[PDB]
Enzyme design. Structure first.
Site, PDB file in Angstrom:
ATOM      1  N   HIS A 137     -12.446   3.343 -94.631  1.00 34.79           N
ATOM      2  CA  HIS A 137     -11.545   3.221 -95.565  1.00 34.79           C
ATOM      3  C   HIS A 137     -11.215   1.894 -96.074  1.00 34.79           C
ATOM      4  CE1 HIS A 137      -7.734   5.216 -97.674  1.00 34.79           C
ATOM      5  NE2 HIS A 137      -8.306   3.864 -98.248  1.00 34.79           N
ATOM      6  N   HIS A 139     -11.799  -1.004 -98.946  1.00 36.43           N
ATOM      7  CA  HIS A 139     -11.639  -1.351-100.559  1.00 36.43           C
ATOM      8  C   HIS A 139     -12.773  -2.669-100.746  1.00 36.43           C
ATOM      9  CE1 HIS A 139      -8.594   1.625-101.869  1.00 36.43           C
ATOM     10  NE2 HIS A 139      -8.539   1.532-100.801  1.00 36.43           N
ATOM     11  N   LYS A 220     -14.890   9.504-103.185  1.00 39.54           N
ATOM     12  CA  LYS A 220     -13.529   9.372-102.656  1.00 39.54           C
ATOM     13  C   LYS A 220     -12.994  10.174-103.962  1.00 39.54           C
ATOM     14  CE  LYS A 220      -9.497   7.863-101.567  1.00 39.54           C
ATOM     15  NZ  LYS A 220      -9.424   6.503-101.369  1.00 39.54           N
ATOM     16  N   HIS A 222      -9.131  10.310-105.414  1.00 35.76           N
ATOM     17  CA  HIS A 222      -7.903   9.638-105.329  1.00 35.76           C
ATOM     18  C   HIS A 222      -7.037  10.274-106.363  1.00 35.76           C
ATOM     19  CE1 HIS A 222      -5.078   6.247-105.383  1.00 35.76           C
ATOM     20  NE2 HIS A 222      -5.706   5.763-104.096  1.00 35.76           N
ATOM     21  N   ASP A 224      -4.889   8.487-108.230  1.00 39.21           N
ATOM     22  CA  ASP A 224      -5.100   7.642-109.313  1.00 39.21           C
ATOM     23  C   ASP A 224      -5.915   7.971-110.417  1.00 39.21           C
ATOM     24  OD1 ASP A 224      -3.136   6.268-107.844  1.00 39.21           O
ATOM     25  OD2 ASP A 224      -3.872   4.488-107.884  1.00 39.21           O
ATOM     26  N   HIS A 249      -7.617  11.274-100.897  1.00 40.07           N
ATOM     27  CA  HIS A 249      -6.186  10.772-101.189  1.00 40.07           C
ATOM     28  C   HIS A 249      -5.593  11.683-102.220  1.00 40.07           C
ATOM     29  CE1 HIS A 249      -3.272   7.396-102.423  1.00 40.07           C
ATOM     30  NE2 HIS A 249      -2.863   8.362-102.992  1.00 40.07           N
ATOM     31  N   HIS A 275      -5.471   8.297 -94.683  1.00 44.63           N
ATOM     32  CA  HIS A 275      -4.062   8.251 -94.216  1.00 44.63           C
ATOM     33  C   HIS A 275      -3.333   9.537 -94.172  1.00 44.63           C
ATOM     34  CE1 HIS A 275      -4.241   8.303 -98.615  1.00 44.63           C
ATOM     35  NE2 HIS A 275      -4.551   6.994 -98.593  1.00 44.63           N
ATOM     36  N   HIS A 323       3.608  -0.737-107.015  1.00 48.17           N
ATOM     37  CA  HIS A 323       3.500   0.096-107.935  1.00 48.17           C
ATOM     38  C   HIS A 323       4.858  -0.303-109.141  1.00 48.17           C
ATOM     39  CE1 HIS A 323       1.673   4.205-106.299  1.00 48.17           C
ATOM     40  NE2 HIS A 323       1.488   3.086-105.447  1.00 48.17           N
ATOM     41  N   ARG A 339       8.103   9.177 -99.833  1.00 52.94           N
ATOM     42  CA  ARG A 339       6.691   8.675 -99.435  1.00 52.94           C
ATOM     43  C   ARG A 339       6.885   7.630 -98.150  1.00 52.94           C
ATOM     44  NH1 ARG A 339       1.384   5.950-102.840  1.00 52.94           N
ATOM     45  NH2 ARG A 339       0.601   5.023-101.072  1.00 52.94           N
ATOM     46  N   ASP A 363      -7.822   0.722 -94.656  1.00 60.16           N
ATOM     47  CA  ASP A 363      -7.491   0.590 -96.218  1.00 60.16           C
ATOM     48  C   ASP A 363      -7.429  -0.944 -96.673  1.00 60.16           C
ATOM     49  OD1 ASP A 363      -6.688   1.786 -98.511  1.00 60.16           O
ATOM     50  OD2 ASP A 363      -5.097   2.984 -97.512  1.00 60.16           O
TER      51      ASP A 363
HETATM   52 NI    NI Z   1      -5.222   6.163-100.494  1.00 59.97          NI
HETATM   53 NI    NI Z   2      -7.216   3.073 -99.956  1.00 59.10          NI
HETATM   54  O   LIG Z   3      -5.386   4.181 -99.678  1.00 59.54           O
END
Ligand code: NI
Ligand code: NI
Ligand SMILES: [O-]
Ligand code: NI
Ligand code: NI
Ligand SMILES: [O-]
Lengths: 570, 100, 122, 570, 100, 100
Positions: A137, A139, A220, A222, A224, A249, A275, A323, A339, A363
Site C-alpha cells: 500500500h 503512494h 486499485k 478507490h 475518490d 478502498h 486498511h 479532507h 469513520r 499507506d
Molecule cells: Ni485508502
Molecule cells: Ni492509500
Molecule cells: O488509503
C-alpha cells in the site's frame, strides 16, 4: 571439549533452545533447530575457519557448487520457522539454507553451499535475519520515501502514484498507459523492488485493461475515483483475465451501496481489501467485516497499529486536515465520527492477533508511515501479549507462534496476495536474495544491512572518512547495490504477463530485473500463512461494537509502546 | 570554510549533542541516540581542546551515568567511536562501555 | 492597508450554479441502518438501494448543490433535496449499471432498478 | 441556488472580476474570463466530481479524447491572458485549455479534455499557474544551481560552461566541439531543459560553425574572448546560416570600438543583447542604448533588478572582487565608476516598465542569482507601480497590463529570442507542459510544484516519513520526474538544426527529448510580447543621464522590497 | 517553512559559527574554518537585523582580531563573502582582510 | 546513533528554531519560516517531553502571538504540522491557526 551456552551464543549466535528478546519488547523467540555441526561453524576473519584449504575450498570454480555469498550463523525469523542456519546466495537468489563451508574437511556441509574463491562473506552471528518487507500500500508521492522504507527493512513497494499530484496523494494509482510508462522509467532509479497499480475504474473493459497491457502489475479501486459497483465489477473482470491483483478502498459514504452491495459486485472473486479496519477508508462503519470472508485478502495500514492513547485524537484531526473538514459543519463532524472509531481500532489489534487480518502495509504518505510497517507489527504483537497473554499455541515460554503469525503479515502474505511470492516474501531456496539483518537490540526498529538481489543496498554505517566504518555518525546510507548500473540487477520491476509478452520492457528500455505477476486469482484467505481464519464478523451499526463467535472484541489503548522513545532522536 | 565531507557530517553530531544536552537540562532521562551524540561530541571537542586519545578513553566513561539515561541504554552501548583532528592529526578514540 | 500575502479581493455579486436548468424538489429517506452520503454529480436514480424516493424523479438528474459537495442521510433520516438536470449528452454509463446509455430510456432504467431492489420504483 | 463570491473563490479559486494579490506586493491581478460552467466545476476527492460515471468518463480509452493529466481550476497568468481554466496535458504537452470532465453529463466540456481512466489530477484551485521560466543567461558553473533555479520556477536554462573553469566563470560559453559534446552528455543528468552556447569568437567561419554542428544551440560573444568587430561579424554570419541566436556582452573597454562600432558590425542582423543596462558588461557608459534598436532583443540580468539602496555599494565591490581591482589604483577605480552607474540602473527600472527592455535573465553564478529571475521581475513591477502609478493602459484598478508585460519578460520573450517558443515559454495548446503552480502568498518567491513535460519534477513538500506530505520540514525536493530514465522524457535538450540533421544525438547516446532551435533570424524587437518599444535612448557620456523622448528617466532607490525578509530564512 | 536550497545550506554556517563561538568561549585560539564561520554568520545575521552592506563591510573587520586565531590564520583569509536577504532583497557582502 | 532519514531531517528544524529564537531574543519580529520553525520544534520537543497530542494542539496556539511576528505572518500560517515520537510511538500533531 565443551563450551557453555552463554559463551557459545556470544561467539556463534544462539543455538537450539536459546531465546532472544526482540528489541525492548517482551517478545522472545526461541531457536527451533540448527543446521550446524558443532565445532565446524563457519566464520570469517584472522585465523578463522573460512580460509583456503580449511573452511574455504581451494579447488572448485564458481559453477561447481560454490556460492557468491555466505551469511554465516543466521538466526532466521520467517513464516517457515525460527531457526539457525547459514544462508547461501548465488546469481542474486537464495540457493541454499543449511551449512556452508568445505566438504574437504567439514562434516554436514550442504552440497551446494561451498565457500570457494568466488565467495563473499557476511557474518550474521548474533543477528536476526528476515525476508525484506513487502509493502503493498504505497503512494508514490516523494522519492525520499524510499530510504525511509529501506531503513525499516522494506524491500518491495507495490502501489501507485506520479508524485505529489492530488490523485496520487489520495490513491495508490498510476493512471493510464502514459503515466504508467513514465513511472516504469522513473522506477529504473529507485533502489527498491516496485510494482505499479493502475486505476481500477471504468464501465468499459478497454480503458482499464490497457493499463495492464502498458505494464501495470495490478489495479486499485478507490472511492475518490468512484468505488461503484460498475468500477468494482470491471476491475475484477480485467484482473481475472490478466492474472493480477485488485486492491480496494471502498465507498465509505455508502453512496452507491453498503458493504453487502460491494461484496455482491465482487461476486466471490479474489480481492485485497486495504486498511480493512476502515479509518484509512471504507464503508462506514462496517468495512472490517470484509476480513471474515474467504475471497478477501485483508490488510491493515499502519497508523491505527496498535491502539494507543493518542490514536483517536491524532486520526480525527488527520482526517479533518486531509479532507478540509470544518469543526462547525455537522455533516463533516458526523462523517469523521462515523469513520474514526475506537471500537473498530481496538478490535483490529485483536483481529491481527487471531490471524483474521492477514497483512500489514503502510499507506505511505497518504495516511500512513513509509518506515513503520515492520515497527508497528511488532508493537502490536507486544501489546497483544501483554493484554491477552501468550497464545494457546505457544510451547515453552517462547513467543514463536505469535512471531511467525506476525512476521507473515509483512513478508509472505503480501507477496502471495500480489502474485509475487515465487520471487520474494520469504527466506526460502529459489527466491530472490532480499534479506534484512537486524541487531536484536534494534530488531524491527532500524535495519543493520539490507541486501537486495544479493548485494547490500542500504546500511547503518559510520564516518566514511574514518579508519574503520563504525565511528560516528552511524546513519542509514545507500550502499554499492544502489550505484551505477548495479541498481538494475539488484531490483525487480513486477509487471503483468501481458505487458511482458508484449515487450514493454524493451519498448521502454527497462534494465531492471523483470518479475512476472501470476497466480493471483486462484487464492483466498486460506492461503494467508498463519493468518487464514474465516469467521462472521459482526459490526453493530449503532454502537460499532465488533463481535466474533458471539464475543465482543475489545481491548484498552496503551500509554506507552516499546520500539519508541528509547530509539528515536525525534 | 572549504568543508570536506566529514566536516559537514560531523556538524550534525555537534547539533544532536546540543539537542540532547537541552533535553537533559530540562530533566529528561536520555535515550540511545541522545546518549551516543553527547559522548561523541564530547570526544570530538576534546580532541579540539588538545587532549590525548588516552585521556579521552578515560573521560568518555564519566560523561553520562546510568541515572542520566533510560532503562537499558547503558547495556545498548558497548562502545562509542569517533575520529577527530588532534594536534597530531586525525586519530580514532574508542570509549568502551561508556555508561556502567 | 494591512497586507495579507496572496489575499483575494473578490468582486461583488453571487454565483448561480446550474443556471437555466430545471430544478425538482423530492423527499428521500434512508431506510438503512448506516449513513449514506451522496455526491453532487452521481446520477440520482443510481444511489444506494436503501434510499427510498420516487426513483423516476431521479432519472436524468443529480443534486443541485455546489460542485464537489454532498448531501448526508443519517440512518432513518428523511429529508427533502433539490435536484437539477444532467447536461452534456445526458447519458450515463456505469455507476450502478442502471442506465448505460441515454437517460431518456426511463422504462428500462426503472425496470432494472425494480428488479435489483432499488427502493421506490412506482 | 447561489454561492457568494468569497465562498466560491475559497472552493474553486477566483472567477471573473475577482482579484488576487501577488505575494506581499501591492500588485493585483484580475480574472479576465473563466472557461467553466458554474456548477460543473471539476474537482477531485471523496464524494467529488471526478469519479467514474460522473465527472470522470468510464467509456473512452486514452486515445479517445482522454487526458493524461488535468489541472483543475487554474488561475493562469501568461502573456496570452490572466484567466481561469482547466489545463489538459497529454503526451507531455498541453493539449487543451478550457473545461475538463465528462461530456456524458456536463455542459461545456472541451472535446479533447475528457477525464478518463487514464487521467491523473492536480488540483490548481486557489493556485496561480504560469509557464516555466526561461533563463537565457546561465553560466554552467556548479550543478547545485539547478535546484536553486527550479525552486524559483525556472524550467529552461540556456547558456554555457564546463563547470568552475575561469572561461565559464566569466562567460556563458561551452567552447568547441569536444566541450560541447561533453556538456551535452552531462545534460542527460540535469533535471531542467538546456541549450548550450558556443564561443562566438574567431576570424574564420569554420572554427565557429563547427560548434553549431557539434550540437550548440547558439553563440555567446563576450569581451573576455575579444568582443571585436571581426568576432561579432563572423558569429552573426554563422548564426544567419545556422538559424540560431547570438548573445552579446560587448566591449566595455571600448578598446576596438564604441557602441556605434559594435552596431555597425552587427549591420542590422538580429542579436540578443545581454545585461543591456551594462553593470553586467558592455560599452561604457552607453550600452543600454542598444535597447532602442529594432534588431536588438534586449535582456537584463538580475542583480540590478530593481534599484535599491544597497545596489551600488554591493555592485561596486562585487566588480572590484571579481576583477581583482585595487582601490588605490586609479585606472581600476575609474573603470569601476564608468561601469556601475546609478543613472543607468535607475533608468533600467523605468525601461522595463515601458516595455523597452523585453527580457529578464539571471547571469547565474557569474554576476547574477540563479533563483531570483522571477523574484526580481515582480519586485521591479511592484516598485514601478509604487513610484510611477498604475500604467495608463490598466482597466478597473487591476494591474493586469503590467502583470502581462512583466510575466512576458521571463517566459515567452526569452523563448522567442532563442528560437524555442514553438516548444516552451507560455501556457498554450501545443507547447510542452512545463508548468509552475504557486500559492498566491508565495507567488514569485517559492514555487509549490514544478511540472516538467507533464510530470512533477520539483516540489515544496514535507516529511517523507509522515502519514501525509505536509508535516515539517517542508522544503524543495526533486520529485519522480527527475528519477531514473524519466529525467529523459520530462526534459528537452535544445540543439541546432545542423547537429540534429547530422545525427549528434545518436552519436552521443542522448536520450532526452531533442528540441530544434529555429526561427531566430527573422525576428526583432517588434516580436517581443508586450515589450516591443523602439525609441532613441540617449545616454549622456559625461553625466550618464538617460533620456527617452527628451525626458530624463530617473527614479529613486528603495530601502525595502516585498518578497524579501517576510519569506527567507537567510 | 518552504526551505529552498540556499536556506538549507546556510543553516550549516550558523551551526558552524555556534560551534566556533563555543570553542572561543572556552579559551581556544580559532582555526581557519572556525574564523570564517563566525564572520560569515555575523554578516548573515547583520543583514537579518537590517544593517546596510556598507555597515557590514566595516563591522566584519572587527569581529575577530589576530589574538583570537591561530598563527597564520589572519593571512590565510583574504576576504569573506556572504549573501543574505536584506530588507531590500539579497545582496553580496565582501569583508576584505577581516583579521589584521 | 543509527540515524534514519527523518531523524537527520528533523535536526534541521531544531536548528532553524534555535536560529529563530536568537533572532527573537535580540528583538526582531519574526518572519514566516522562523515562526514555523519555532512552533514546529516546540511540538517535537513536547512529544519528547511526553505531552499528549491534545495538549500540543492547545499549547501550539500560544507559542507566538501576532506582536512576535511581521505583518501578515499570522494569516500566512493556516496550520503547522509535525510528527514526532511520543511515548506511544509516532503521532501527527496539527496546530490550527497557531498565531491569531
Ligand atoms: Ni485508502
Ligand atoms: Ni492509500
Ligand atoms: O488509503
Ligand atoms: Ni556578461
Ligand atoms: Ni554572464
Ligand atoms: O555576464
Amino acid at each position: 571439549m565443551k563450551i557453555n551456552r552463554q559463551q557459545y551464543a556470544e561467539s556463534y549466535g544462539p543455538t537450539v533452545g536459546d531465546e532472544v528478546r526482540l528489541a525492548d519488547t517482551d517478545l522472545w523467540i526461541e531457536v527451533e533447530k540448527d543446521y550446524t555441526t558443532y565445532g565446524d561453524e563457519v566464520n570469517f576473519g584472522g585465523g578463522k575457519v573460512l580460509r583456503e584449504g580449511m573452511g574455504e575450498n581451494g579447488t572448485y570454480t564458481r559453477t561447481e557448487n560454490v556460492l557468491d555469498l555466505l551469511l554465516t550463523n543466521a538466526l532466521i525469523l520467517d513464516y517457515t520457522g525460527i531457526y539457525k542456519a547459514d544462508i547461501g546466495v548465488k546469481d542474486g537468489y537464495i540457493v541454499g539454507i543449511g551449512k556452508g563451508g568445505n566438504p574437504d574437511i567439514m562434516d554436514g556441509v550442504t552440497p551446494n553451499m561451498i565457500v570457494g574463491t568466488a565467495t563473499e562473506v557476511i557474518a550474521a552471528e548474533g543477528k536476526i535475519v528476515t525476508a525484506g518487507g513487502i509493502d503493498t500500500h504505497v503512494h508514490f508521492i516523494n522519492p525520499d520515501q524510499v530510504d525511509v522504507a529501506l531503513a525499516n527493512g522494506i524491500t518491495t513497494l507495490f502501489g501507485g502514484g506520479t508524485g505529489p499530484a492530488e490523485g496520487s496523494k489520495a490513491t495508490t494509482v498510476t493512471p493510464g498507459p502514459w503515466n504508467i510508462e513514465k513511472m516504469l522509467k522513473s522506477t529504473e532509479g529507485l533502489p527498491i523492488n516496485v510494482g505499479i497499480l493502475g486505476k481500477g475504474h471504468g464501465s468499459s473493459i478497454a480503458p482499464i485493461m490497457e493499463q495492464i497491457d502498458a505494464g501495470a502489475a495490478g489495479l486499485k479501486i478507490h472511492e475518490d475515483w468512484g468505488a461503484t459497483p460498475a468500477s468494482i465489477d470491471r476491475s475484477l473482470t480485467v484482473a481475472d483475465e490478466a492474472d493480477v491483483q485488485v486492491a480496494i478502498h471502498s465507498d465509505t459514504l455508502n453512496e452507491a451501496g453498503f458493504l453487502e452491495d460491494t461484496l455482491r459486485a465482487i461476486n466471490g472473486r479474489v480481492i485485497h481489501s486495504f486498511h480493512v479496519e476502515g479509518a484509512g477508508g471504507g464503508h462506514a462503519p462496517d468495512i472490517m467485516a470484509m476480513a471474515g470472508h474467504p475471497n478477501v485478502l485483508p490488510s491493515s495500514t499502519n497508523p491505527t497499529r496498535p491502539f494507543t492513547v493518542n490514536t483517536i485524537d491524532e486520526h480525527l484531526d488527520m482526517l479533518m486536515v486531509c479532507h478540509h473538514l470544518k469543526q462547525n459543519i455537522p455533516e463533516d463532524v458526523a462523517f469523521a465520527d462515523s469513520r474514526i472509531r475506537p471500537e473498530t481500532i481496538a478490535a483490529e489489534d485483536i483481529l491481527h492477533d487471531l490471524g483474521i487480518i492477514s497483512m500489514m502495509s503502510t499507506d505511505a504518505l497518504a495516511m500512513g508511515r513509509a518506515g513503520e510497517m515492520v515497527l508497528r507489527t511488532w508493537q502490536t504483537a507486544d501489546k497483544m501479549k501483554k493484554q491477552r497473554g501468550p497464545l494457546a499455541e505457544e510451547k515453552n515460554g517462547s513467543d514463536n507462534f505469535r512471531l511467525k503469525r506476525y512476521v507473515s503479515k509483512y513478508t509472505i502474505n503480501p507477496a502471495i496476495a500480489q502474485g509475487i511470492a515465487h520471487e520474494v516474501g520469504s527466506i526460502e531456496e529459489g527466491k530472490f536474495a532480499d534479506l534484512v539483518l537486524w541487531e536484536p537490540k534494534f530488531f524491527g526498529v532500524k535495519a543493520d544491512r539490507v541486501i537486495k538481489g544479493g548485494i547490500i543496498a542500504y546500511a547503518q554505517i559510520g564516518d566514511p572518512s574514518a579508519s574503520i566504518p563504525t565511528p560516528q555518525p552511524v546513519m542509514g546510507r545507500r550502499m554499492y547495490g544502489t550505484v551505477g548500473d548495479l541498481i538494475h540487477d539488484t531490483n525487480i520491476t513486477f509487471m503483468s504477463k501481458s505487458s511482458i509478452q508484449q515487450g514493454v520492457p524493451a519498448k521502454l528500455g527497462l534494465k531492471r530485473r523483470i518479475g512476472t505477476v501470476k497466480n493471483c486469482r486462484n487464492i483466498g484467505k486460506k492461503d494467508m500463512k498463519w493468518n487464514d481464519v474465516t469467521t462472521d464478523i459482526d459490526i453493530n451499526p449503532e454502537t460499532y461494537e465488533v463481535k466474533v463467535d458471539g464475543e465482543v472484541l475489545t481491548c484498552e489503548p496503551v500509554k506507552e509502546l516499546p520500539m519508541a522513545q528509547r530509539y528515536f532522536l525525534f | 570554510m572549504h568543508l570536506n565531507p566529514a566536516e559537514k557530517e560531523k556538524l550534525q553530531i555537534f547539533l544532536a549533542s546540543e539537542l540532547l544536552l537541552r533535553r537533559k537540562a530540562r530533566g529528561l532521562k536520555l535515550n540511545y541516540p541522545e546518549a551516543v551524540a553527547i559522548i561523541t561530541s564530547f570526544i570530538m571537542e576534546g580532541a579540539r581542546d588538545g587532549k590525548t586519545v588516552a585521556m579521552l578513553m578515560e573521560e568518555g566513561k564519566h560523561v553520562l551515568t546510568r541515572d542520566d539515561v533510560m532503562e537499558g541504554v547503558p547495556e545498548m552501548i558497548d562502545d562509542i567511536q569517533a575520529e577527530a583532528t588532534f594536534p597530531d592529526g586525525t586519530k580514532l578514540v574508542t570509549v568502551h562501555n561508556p555508561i556502567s | 492597508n494591512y497586507i495579507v500575502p496572496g489575499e483575494y479581493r473578490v468582486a461583488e455579486g453571487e454565483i448561480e450554479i446550474n443556471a437555466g436548468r430545471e430544478k425538482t424538489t423530492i423527499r428521500v429517506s434512508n431506510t438503512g441502518d448506516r449513513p449514506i452520503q451522496v455526491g453532487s454529480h452521481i446520477h440520482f436514480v443510481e444511489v444506494n438501494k436503501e434510499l427510498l424516493f420516487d426513483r423516476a424523479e431521479g432519472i436524468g438528474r443529480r443534486l443541485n448543490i455546489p460542485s464537489g459537495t454532498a448531501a448526508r442521510f443519517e440512518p432513518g433520516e428523511e429529508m427533502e433535496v433539490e435536484l437539477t438536470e444532467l447536461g452534456g449528452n445526458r447519458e450515463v454509463f456505469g455507476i450502478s449499471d442502471l442506465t448505460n446509455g441515454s437517460v431518456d430510456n426511463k422504462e428500462l432504467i426503472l425496470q432494472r432498478a425494480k428488479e435489483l431492489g432499488y427502493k421506490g420504483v412506482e
